[PDB]
Write a protein that binds this ligand. Sequence first.
Ligand SMILES: CSC[C@@H](OC(=O)[C@H](CS)NC(=O)CCC[C@H](N)C(=O)O)C(=O)O
Ligand SMILES: [Fe+2]
Length: 329
Amino acid sequence: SVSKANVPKIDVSPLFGDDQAAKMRVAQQIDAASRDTGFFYAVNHGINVQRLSQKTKEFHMSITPEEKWDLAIRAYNKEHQDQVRAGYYLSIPGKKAVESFCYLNPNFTPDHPRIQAKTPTHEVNVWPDETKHPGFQDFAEQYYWDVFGLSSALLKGYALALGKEENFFARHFKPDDTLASVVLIRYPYLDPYPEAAIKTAADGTKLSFEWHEDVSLITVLYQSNVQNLQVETAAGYQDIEADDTGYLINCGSYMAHLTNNYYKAPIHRVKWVNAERQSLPFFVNLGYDSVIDPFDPREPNGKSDREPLSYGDYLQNGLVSLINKNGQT
Ligand SMILES: CSC[C@@H](OC(=O)[C@H](CS)NC(=O)CCC[C@H](N)C(=O)O)C(=O)O
Ligand SMILES: [Fe+2]
């Protein structure tokens, strides 16, 4: 009774290469999707998503309660005051179904100047014991760089789409300083599924996570093949078809700011489904001091009545606001 959202598949492979005309034809497809529902699937992205899913499953299904406390963010473990972002986010049986593991830039090491300075939103990742999870830390760090590479290519396409040179965003998206994160979200099957863990939208739809815009520049998402996402359009909420072979891409509210809402950050939500599944976002965040001057591609002089906002300010406020709105995940 809900209609299907228009979410085109775009072959992004030309964004990795040097065929400028072909990159422009990709850019156009990105422009079109961004102005329509705000979602598309990136196909021919080069990443082994089946192996991602398998390694992620192995982790989620083998990590023990003892380990989850030992890795827990501050919201679950007061001993871990430095873990605001990175670490384990516990479920609460009977009340909260979702659980997840977040990690940041592998280059945020104890000697990183921003870690030394204790700058907000920068943390050193926590990992489980290697002997209990062999290969996991190395797999996950490598995945960070594989999805970083895809995101750089995507950002070349968004820049071209907006009438800019292809490095317009990508120059602010750097291995040594990016605030990008990976989140490995487990949405469990539960029998019985507690009502407490199911939210209800104003329209009656049962949800697992309420409506929101993403806190990102763009978001680069892998999910299992279980339909769950909806996007608000002018025709109401529409269902996003699942595709476990591609990456679902959308703009976050930083892109909306920079573009004066020419590329809106689409409002979307997560339907409740009683299915064991994965939601594995990569949030494309810039550096803490990155500032892009806002502009408007619908105005002849390109000028915007919005003020510049540094990415670090944006991100810290955004993540707090999202927790206030939709709850601690
Ligand atoms: C379809 S919304 C994507 C995913 O939800 C999230 O990841 C939500 C909404 S985008 N994001 C967050 O909670 C922000 C996580 C930020 C992360 N802890 C960080 O520090 O970067 C889900 O529930 O499937
Ligand atoms: Fe989201």
